[PDB]
């Protein structure tokens, strides 16, 4: 749908997101710094969160899932206000 850059930037992210879930420790700031960078509609931005949750569950990263859940909350509220505003 988007450009050659975007399509690919989103692939590079997915990959890096998977490396980031598989790091030791509890610094998930690198993950969000990255998740902010995804290109496209709020749909795909929220698809990137959904995906990261699936990963982090496999590694039982409970805190990280909480924080991903909050992105999901925020991506939802913004979308709810979209219809209200438009």
């Amino acid at each position: 749908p988007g450009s050659a850059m975007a399509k690919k930037i989103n692939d590079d992210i997915k990959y890096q997101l998977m490396k980031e879930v598989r790091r030791f420790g509890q610094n998930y700031e690198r993950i969000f710094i990255l998740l902010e960078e995804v290109q496209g509609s709020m749909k795909v931005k929220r698809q990137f969160v959904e995906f990261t949750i699936k990963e982090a569950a496999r590694f039982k990263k409970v805190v990280l899932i909480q924080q991903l859940e909050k992105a999901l909350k925020e991506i939802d509220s913004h979308c709810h206000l979209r219809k209200v505003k438009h």
Binding site: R23, F24, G25, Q26, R58, F59, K60, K61, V62
Partner: protein, 395 residues
């Protein structure tokens, strides 16, 4: 409530002329200005508040130097706040000025919780205390809680949040100097295995093997492990590595198997499975392994059976008899239910072993025990285990 003028002028001299040596001599003056006589009582409340607002200047910059020499430690601790500790190191538990000077800290701790692990640091950093951690026990039994363990658990957790590199530095003396408080609760382990990287994991693993750190003893560990079943994947992997480093016998923690569930403890199942490979199977181990429920997607059982049945064929067959005896005869209902599980496990092994060339089920002690067991069970099962029991007929 407002500041005494003799004290007040010297507060912001540290602020203006922000040069090391002079500030510390300016701070030494505050120690001598706290003694005198009565000098109010609850004046420290606002006193700690100002010093807190003053010293929040270095409560952001990470504490451990780049270079870790014993002189780099002494070189780094030359901060005005740290001299406040030095005085308390050079005193006694039975002094009038003591319990008064401590109360200053105990009031400041509320306004800066990061003072907790800072104390811990100082005691091990400077040879002004060498290793007299007794000061922290005083500091703890001086906090509102009064409990040492709980007070320690607060600082280490605080430390993990703030400066994980410090946490990895402090660990040894924390586990060493407060063994009673540390070796038992799986709080401190979880904490530690929740932040460390593989670089720091090796460092711990080595400390243990050098004998400079013990993180669990045999009478405490099995409980800690049951707890880790509930941790994050890597936290578990690390836990199991540190275990493997202490050289507590696998026998100690073997009862854990009853807890391990196919679909939900893959980490510990892996870890354990590869440890059991190295062991001469005992009576217990064989009993434990067989005890697991027969789940057609669980391959833990026949995996360790195969490998044992092929390194230690006779010893296993011994153990398998031993148990079969102990179950056929001695609650019959439960006995027969348990014995069914054993039979199912055995059948799985029988089937696996047909993909290779080993005469395990061939050897006699096995038959003697099966032959015997068939004559004392329900005829419904006798026919499910046709193939299994049929291999004994020729005796």
């Amino acid at each position: 409530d407002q500041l005494d003028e003799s004290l007040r002028d010297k507060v912001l001299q540290l602020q203006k002329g922000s040069d090391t040596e002079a500030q510390c001599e300016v701070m030494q003056e505050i120690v001598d200005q706290v003694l005198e006589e009565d000098f109010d009582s609850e004046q420290l409340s606002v006193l700690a508040s100002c010093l807190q607002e003053l010293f929040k200047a270095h409560f952001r910059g990470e504490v451990l130097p780049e270079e870790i020499t014993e002189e780099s430690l002494e070189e780094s601790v030359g901060k005005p706040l740290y001299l406040i500790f030095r005085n308390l190191c050079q005193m006694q538990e039975d002094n009038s000025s003591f319990s008064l000077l401590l109360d200053l800290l105990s009031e400041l701790y509320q306004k800066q919780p990061k003072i907790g692990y800072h104390l811990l640091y100082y005691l091990r950093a400077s040879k002004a205390a060498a290793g007299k951690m007794n000061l922290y026990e005083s500091f703890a039994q001086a906090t509102q809680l009064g409990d040492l363990h709980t007070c320690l658990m607060m600082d280490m957790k605080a430390c993990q949040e703030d400066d994980v590199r410090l946490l990895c530095h402090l660990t040894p003396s924390i586990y060493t100097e407060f063994p009673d408080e540390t070796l038992r609760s799986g709080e401190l382990l979880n904490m530690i295995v929740a932040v460390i990287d593989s670089a720091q994991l090796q460092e711990l693993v080595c400390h243990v093997m050098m004998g400079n750190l013990v993180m669990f003893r045999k009478d405490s560990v099995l409980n800690i492990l049951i707890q880790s079943l509930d941790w994050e994947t890597f936290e578990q992997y690390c836990a199991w590595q540190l275990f493997l480093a202490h050289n507590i016998p696998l026998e100690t923690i073997i009862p854990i198997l009853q807890h391990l569930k196919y679909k939900e403890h893959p980490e510990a199942l892996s870890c354990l499975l590869l440890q059991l490979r190295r062991e001469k199977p005992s009576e217990e181990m064989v009993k434990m392994v067989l005890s697991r429920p027969c789940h057609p997607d669980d391959q833990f059982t026949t995996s360790i059976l195969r490998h044992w049945c092929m390194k230690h064929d006779e010893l296993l067959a011994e153990h398998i008899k031993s148990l079969l005896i102990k179950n056929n005869s001695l609650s019959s209902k439960l006995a027969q239910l348990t014995l069914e599980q054993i039979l199912e496990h055995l059948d799985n092994l029988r089937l696996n072993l047909t993909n290779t060339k080993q005469n395990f089920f061939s050897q006699t002690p096995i038959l003697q025990a099966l032959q015997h067991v068939q004559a004392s069970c329900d005829e419904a099962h006798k026919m499910k285990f046709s193939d299994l029991f049929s291999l004994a007929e020729e005796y």
